[PDB]
Amino acid sequence: GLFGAIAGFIENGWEGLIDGWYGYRHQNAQGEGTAADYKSTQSAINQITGKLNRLIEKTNQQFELIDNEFNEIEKQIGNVINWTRDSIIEVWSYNAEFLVAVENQHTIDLTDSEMNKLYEKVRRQLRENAEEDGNGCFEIFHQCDNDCMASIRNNTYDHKKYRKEAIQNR
Amino acid sequence: GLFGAIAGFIENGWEGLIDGWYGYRHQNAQGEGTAADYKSTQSAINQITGKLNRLIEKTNQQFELIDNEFNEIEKQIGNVINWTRDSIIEVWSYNAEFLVAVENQHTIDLTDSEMNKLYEKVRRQLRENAEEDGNGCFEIFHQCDNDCMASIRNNTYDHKKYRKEAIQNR
Amino acid sequence: GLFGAIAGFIENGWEGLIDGWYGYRHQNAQGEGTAADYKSTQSAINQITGKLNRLIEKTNQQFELIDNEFNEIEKQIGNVINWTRDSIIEVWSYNAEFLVAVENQHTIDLTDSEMNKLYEKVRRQLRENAEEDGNGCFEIFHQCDNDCMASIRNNTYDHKKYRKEAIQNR
Amino acid sequence: DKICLGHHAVSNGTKVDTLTEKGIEVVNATETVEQKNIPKICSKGKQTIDLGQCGLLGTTIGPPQCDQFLEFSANLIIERREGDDICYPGKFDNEETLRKILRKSGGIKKENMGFTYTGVRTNGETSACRRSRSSFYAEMKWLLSNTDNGVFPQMTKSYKNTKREPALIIWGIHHSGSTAEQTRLYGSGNKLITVWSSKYQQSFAPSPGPRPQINGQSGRIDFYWLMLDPNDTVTFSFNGAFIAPDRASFLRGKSLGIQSDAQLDNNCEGECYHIGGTIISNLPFQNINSRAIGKCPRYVKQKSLMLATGMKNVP
Amino acid sequence: DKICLGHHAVSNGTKVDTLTEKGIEVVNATETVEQKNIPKICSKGKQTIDLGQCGLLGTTIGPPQCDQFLEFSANLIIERREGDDICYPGKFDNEETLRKILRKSGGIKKENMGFTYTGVRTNGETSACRRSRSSFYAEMKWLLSNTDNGVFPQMTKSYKNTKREPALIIWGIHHSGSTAEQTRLYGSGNKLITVWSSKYQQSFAPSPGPRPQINGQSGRIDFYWLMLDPNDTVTFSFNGAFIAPDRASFLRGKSLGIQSDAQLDNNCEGECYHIGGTIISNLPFQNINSRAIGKCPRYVKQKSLMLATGMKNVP
Amino acid sequence: DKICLGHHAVSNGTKVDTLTEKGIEVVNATETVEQKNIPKICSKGKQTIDLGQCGLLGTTIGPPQCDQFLEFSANLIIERREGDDICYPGKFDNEETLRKILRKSGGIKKENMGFTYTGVRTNGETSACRRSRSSFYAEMKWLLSNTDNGVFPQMTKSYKNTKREPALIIWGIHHSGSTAEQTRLYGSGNKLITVWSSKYQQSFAPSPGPRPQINGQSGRIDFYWLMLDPNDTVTFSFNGAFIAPDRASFLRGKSLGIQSDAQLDNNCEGECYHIGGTIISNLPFQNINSRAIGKCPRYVKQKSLMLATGMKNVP
Ligand SMILES: *[C@@H]1O[C@H](CO)[C@@H](O)[C@H](O)[C@H]1NC(C)=O
Ligand SMILES: *[C@@H]1O[C@H](CO)[C@@H](O)[C@H](O)[C@H]1NC(C)=O
Numbered sequence A, B, C: 001g002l003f004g005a006i007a008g009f010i011e012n013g014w015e016g017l018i019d020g021w022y023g024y025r026h027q028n029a030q031g032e033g034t035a036a037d038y039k040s041t042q043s044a045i046n047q048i049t050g051k052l053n054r055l056i057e058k059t060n061q062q063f064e065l066i067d068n069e070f071n072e073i074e075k076q077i078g079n080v081i082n083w084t085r086d087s088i089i090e091v092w093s094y095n096a097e098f099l100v101a102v103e104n105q106h107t108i109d110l111t112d113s114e115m116n117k118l119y120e121k122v123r124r125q126l127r128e129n130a131e132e133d134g135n136g137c138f139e140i141f142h143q144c145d146n147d148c149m150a151s152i153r154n155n156t157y158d159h160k161k162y163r164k165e166a167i168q169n170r
Numbered sequence D, E, F: 001d002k003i004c005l006g007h008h009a010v011s012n013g014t015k016v017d018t019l020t021e022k023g024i025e026v027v028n029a030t031e032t033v034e035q036k037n038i039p040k041i042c043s044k045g046k047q048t049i050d051l052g053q054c055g056l057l058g059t060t061i062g063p064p065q066c067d068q069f070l071e072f073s074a075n076l077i078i079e080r081r082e083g084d085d086i087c088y089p090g091k092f093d094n095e096e097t098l099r100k101i102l103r104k105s106g107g108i109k110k111e112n113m114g115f116t117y118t119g120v121r122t123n124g125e126t127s128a129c130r131r132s133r134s135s136f137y138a139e140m141k142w143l144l145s146n147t148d149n150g151v152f153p154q155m156t157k158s159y160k161n162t163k164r165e166p167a168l169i170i171w172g173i174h175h176s177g178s179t180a181e182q183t184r185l186y187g188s189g190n191k192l193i194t195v196w197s198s199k200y201q202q203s204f205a206p207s208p209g210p211r212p213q214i215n216g217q218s219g220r221i222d223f224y225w226l227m228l229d230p231n232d233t234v235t236f237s238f239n240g241a242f243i244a245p246d247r248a249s250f251l252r253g254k255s256l257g258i259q260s261d262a263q264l265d266n267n268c269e270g271e272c273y274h275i276g277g278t279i280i281s282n283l284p285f286q287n288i289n290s291r292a293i294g295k296c297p298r299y300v301k302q303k304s305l306m307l308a309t310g311m312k313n314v315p
């Protein structure tokens, strides 16, 4: 990816996570839990489904026979047919390979963006109260129980509340 | 956008701003003012104008009549014409839709980059002296009047000068 | 670039650097040295070489003569040939210009990503221990000799070790 | 204590390609290149004619194989490999132009041309075209001298297309398989057939002599055809060696001609046909048949073009 | 106290499409698909000929409608719907190949072929081609027997193209509308016209008998034409039923043939024409006419392809 | 004290283009549009025939220039600008269709058709086709009346293709350069040549009279040809003015015909040819010749398409 998040600064993704596409993994007073993010997952899926809306259909472009399977058309005109049919098949084949290569590049770079997008808006929730690990983890100076974890994920978290004990724990 | 700035972490853009494309909005000792950034605006416009330089012209590719509007050409050759003309119109129509879809994707991702690019170089100007709000706002520990605001926008601002009172105001 | 690193927040790149593609430049107790990063250089080169693997070959698409250089084919069929050959050359020429324009856009945005990717993973190594200059430089609160420099580049660096003197040197 | 961000994965991954790399692994991915055929002609709620042994061109002149279709009416015309347009051996001229016409014809209504003859046999027939007994083409008349060697008299027959639509007119020229026979059927002397509309004008003379036997005839009957504009008039003058029409064809409407080896099925519906059957698929490409027709996906050379529907895959 | 970063917007937004989404709203956006026609032929500072009633092929043989153009000279040739190449009814052979030639001809210079005849009327004419009085084609001679039924004598006329450029040669074959008349004009006996260069060699025989009346002639005169290489020589032998040339055409230079219903305008300039007029536009695509010609934008099926010229739009 | 991140550069930069900008400077960049020609035909380990003066169509009928190739065998056939298919002046009919066939033929095996004649000279020859002494085409027989003006007798010759592959059959029609001469060689009276398979049937009559002199013959011999299906039978009846075959051609296998001005070279190998020689290149495009053939890069109008192989360049 161009955003260097998926198989980049994030060592890798978690084979457990059967709940969504991007998620949270916590370690606190209480022990551990791992839980899926609906918003980042839904944004990626909205945009992957949006590419398949574009492609999965067909344009009304219908064709009739200009040569004959059973009984070969005159040779002069037939060469031109074959060559024109060959030049068109050569061109649609480049066009499909390159559309899909471009769609695959942007599909990956897009998911890599939604990984980074979640990380950054979590980083902003904790303005002073925590500092970046670097393996895509946030180390919190203040202790953060399952109610405090559910508030970052539930996106109700109050930085104002824990800034007191966290900041002074420089 | 892939940079997750426009209609992302920035709640949204300001219907007031008739002055440029990206701007600054301040709240200080003095009250309020909202003012346009020339550099981020000009970089986006340089690159949007650059795409229209590529497209708005035409290649010298001129065509002559190979069939007749008034008086239908022989049927054998005419089918081949129609079918070749249909296969070419099918192909230019995919090529235009996809060029414009790719140009629209990169046009948006490019403006989204220039939003993020301004935010980051402002963040760097205030190295210690302020800490990120998360709605695309910088909360300054030190008070910052219209002369101090004009210096971040005028890009003359001295972090060294206010680091004293701001840093210790942890 | 979309990542705003190359010819952006980095003033510019260093004409000295004959060793690799992205590198480190240090100023310490000892004086100065400038040294190349293998990982960021190798990732960019892996992906530039990967585009030339795609393009540098050819598809098996072979063509035979449907007109005659020495002795002009009948005029009716010949116009159709010329026009079909012209419509195909018009189309491959758009297809090549646009492939290469798209490959050039993504080639640049990709190198711009690998510039930014190195900067961010260096920023994370120094979690508390240094704060961003803004010309793509990290100002370290703690003094950092050639052994300390070789550890950030050698990527063995221990933030835990120097956090003591650096953090308190707010 | 701490919180941690990341993404999902499974080590049952799928390979895709990009501008940058050949065979990146991802979470979910889909085929865009349909390669699953239906070996049926999916014909539901489309008026479908199966010519089988009937030649498509044969519907216009009416060999036995075609007697069920002299006035066929269809949106979907299925030409078969076994299907054969004639009985007394011969070709149609620009046969394929004429096929392309009929394939899109919606079928054909026959209308009487209202020729009738005097001082010629009209009833000339052939074991090549048997129905129950030596017969001939349905729509045609095989004009012969009254007696063996009798002199077929110079003659003209004219037909004005008074209909709003153009009339398909066919006629034949008879290559007796010996100049001996030519003269037995038509009388000696060079035989001439000239045909003309406002705009068309062609001469035909028979080239008697022995071809190879086919359905047991060393002779040959080549068909020629034109499309008579309305208020236009085809004139036939002839000397003998002429196979007259009896009926004009008028095209019915719109249809689609397909060549196919696949059986019918009025249970399934489908928009796209080829020699091997029907392509039903919403995928933008296909690798089944570059010569398929109907409403189809763009055919591509590639066996497989996997499109990413999920992020990069990291175990 | 604080400073704040963001971007502009208006809630008068414009919809565009991307790889990812159908109908994203943005700040500014532009049409790339020109659909605004000029219902004029924008002809400024281009030598422009309007054939109107003159048929393009008619400039080579010279029916009345065409007398103003027997030697026409033009960069831009406008063929009109009303325009008609002949007067005594008939067709040109590969007429459209010949049109494509003339459309690009830059016009035509006429040069004398220097035939003259003896023991034939040369002066044969028709109320079909009237100028003031029964006349004939400008460039042609209608060779007839001296007297009704008189025997048109076998004859040859030869013309060497001694010019640096190839000579356009036309000739006609005369389908008298009755074998009765054929023989009145030419004498009885089969009529033959053979024509040959180094490289070309064709026979033509008339097919007399009654076509439909057109401009009041049941007869027909079909034109045949070849392009005589320099130092090459066309030879005409003939028996009668032959319409001679009098002049060869030589192509002038380069031009462009357009078919159009739109009026001229020497006030505007423009590079791209179609049936409905001129496309002036810098846009890369157009949806006006897939059959347009000149220097044009790629025609596309799409009515509209909106390209983004501003960021995403958020109220 | 501090550490610093950045990228490399040199001020010897290379310009490239993008969606966004015309002439961005970058570190390294490469040409994708091969414009370097090899002015040779790179023929190594490909069976290569150089027709030089031999016309490709000439291998089937055998003028002197072609005597080395009557049975040529090759994967790569080089047609030359100087190369000429005949000796007694004339054309082949659909010559280019026939060329396209032979260009891919793999060469031709000749097989005897086993005609022999009686009461005609068979030995007719011409200073046009000299080997050592007035000769004629290798594969052909020039049938003439036994004596000047003697009456060439009506005649038929038949040849069944009993081989698994279709037989290429040629025959000629002889335009004596005066009706005087026609009758000297063949006798007076109209001359007729009819030819027919199961499926083909055509008449030919000579059009005697004087063409321009070419290799010293005002007369002309036009060749006609068909492709005889196996178990099919070509029949030739004729009166005179007929140039018989003596041998059928059978195609050998697969090959490639190229038109070229470039010398051979069995030292180099190469997959892609044009008038000017061989394109060897792994680049995806080329601007050398839009009419090149073999296994080639897509030809593009652009002189240069520079692809970025390094980052943006900043001094
Ligand atoms: C064109 O290719 C077809 C198969 O699509 C082959 O059977 C045929 O021989 C070729 N036709 C001509 C007229 O070259
Ligand atoms: C091709 O389409 C045209 C309109 O572009 C239509 O009027 C015509 O009938 C078709 N021509 C042939 C020869 O099929």
Ligand SMILES: *[C@@H]1O[C@H](CO)[C@@H](O)[C@H](O)[C@H]1NC(C)=O
Pocket (backbone or CB within 6 Å): C072, C073, C074, C075, C078, C079, C082
């Ligand atoms: C087509 O262009 C060629 C060059 O490729 C030119 O020499 C020729 O005159 C044109 N042919 C026809 C048949 O218009």
Ligand SMILES: *[C@@H]1O[C@H](CO)[C@@H](O)[C@H](O)[C@H]1NC(C)=O
Pocket (backbone or CB within 6 Å): D163, D164, D230, D231
């Ligand atoms: C044909 O002729 C009739 C009268 O003979 C006339 O009224 C009609 O408009 C013409 N029809 C067509 C289709 O040209």
Ligand SMILES: *[C@@H]1O[C@H](CO)[C@@H](O)[C@H](O)[C@H]1NC(C)=O
Pocket (backbone or CB within 6 Å): E163, E164, E230, E231
């Ligand atoms: C034609 O012939 C003349 C003399 O008759 C000769 O000098 C000239 O080069 C030839 N011109 C062309 C255009 O072949």
Ligand SMILES: *[C@@H]1O[C@H](CO)[C@@H](O)[C@H](O)[C@H]1NC(C)=O
Pocket (backbone or CB within 6 Å): F163, F164, F230, F231
């Ligand atoms: C041709 O005929 C022979 C016998 O005459 C027969 O056995 C064979 O199968 C036929 N060959 C072809 C190639 O049709």
